Curated annotation (Swiss-Prot):
Gene Ontology molecular functions: cyclosporin A binding; peptidyl-prolyl cis-trans isomerase activity
Gene (name only): PPIF
Subcellular locations according to the entry: Mitochondrion matrix
Lineage: Eukaryota, Metazoa, Chordata, Craniata, Vertebrata
Catalytic activity: [protein]-peptidylproline (omega=180) = [protein]-peptidylproline (omega=0)
A GO CC term attached to the entry: mitochondrion
Modified-residue entries (S-nitrosocysteine), positions: 159
Residues annotated as domain PPIase cyclophilin-type: 5-161
EC number: 5.2.1.8
Family as reported in the entry's similarity comment: Belongs to the cyclophilin-type PPIase family.
Record keywords, A-Z: Acetylation, Apoptosis, Isomerase, Mitochondrion, Necrosis, Rotamase, S-nitrosylation, Transit peptide
Protein name per UniProt: Peptidyl-prolyl cis-trans isomerase F, mitochondrial
Summary of activators and inhibitors of this protein: Inhibited by cyclosporin A (CsA). Is displaced by CsA from the mPTP leading to a lower open probability of the mPTP.
First-to-last residue of the parent protein present: 45 to 207 of 207
Length: 163
């Protein structure tokens, strides 16, 4: 399975690196979309964009590199893409899953859970998990709020593929 990284800062101060394993063995199409958006190999992707909605005891959401507010993004497939499967569950902190606006509306937005979000099982496609840097995710979470507005600007300053 591919390993990818997000290097994250808050108001220009590095928080550290999040390493994500992408479950290409279970959701290859969804994993590949995220992988390519981390490398930027199609000319666009996550680098320089933000965690735009962060809610403590819920999740940290990112990937809206077009509108920066939870309405945008772009997949590698030329359109919103179907939910590949709902095999993997939102079992706990560190789960990596696709944001959406209903069934079969995957783009580029994604989230990292900070709790078991079992009420999202069967609604959002889980496709990976944090293997290093959960403490960075907890730091991101600490800048969240009830509304999801962040108290510092949380930026993916670099991202890419490790292996």
């Amino acid at each position: 399975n591919p390993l990818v990284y997000l290097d994250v800062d808050a108001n220009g101060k590095p928080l550290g690196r999040v390493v994500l394993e992408l479950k290409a063995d279970v959701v290859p199409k969804t994993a590949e979309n995220f992988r390519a958006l981390c490398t930027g190999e199609k000319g666009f992707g996550y680098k320089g964009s933000t965690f735009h909605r962060v809610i403590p005891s819920f999740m940290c959401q990112a990937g809206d590199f077009t509108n920066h507010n939870g309405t945008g993004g772009k997949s590698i497939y030329g359109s919103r893409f179907p939910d590949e499967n709902f095999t993997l569950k939102h079992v706990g902190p560190g789960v990596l899953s696709m944001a959406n606006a209903g069934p079969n509306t995957n783009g580029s937005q994604f989230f990292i859970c900070t709790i078991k979000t079992d009420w999202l099982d069967g609604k959002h496609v889980v496709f990976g998990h944090v293997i290093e840097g959960m403490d960075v995710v907890k730091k991101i979470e600490s800048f969240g709020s009830k509304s999801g507005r962040t108290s510092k600007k949380i930026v993916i300053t670099d991202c890419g593929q490790l292996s």
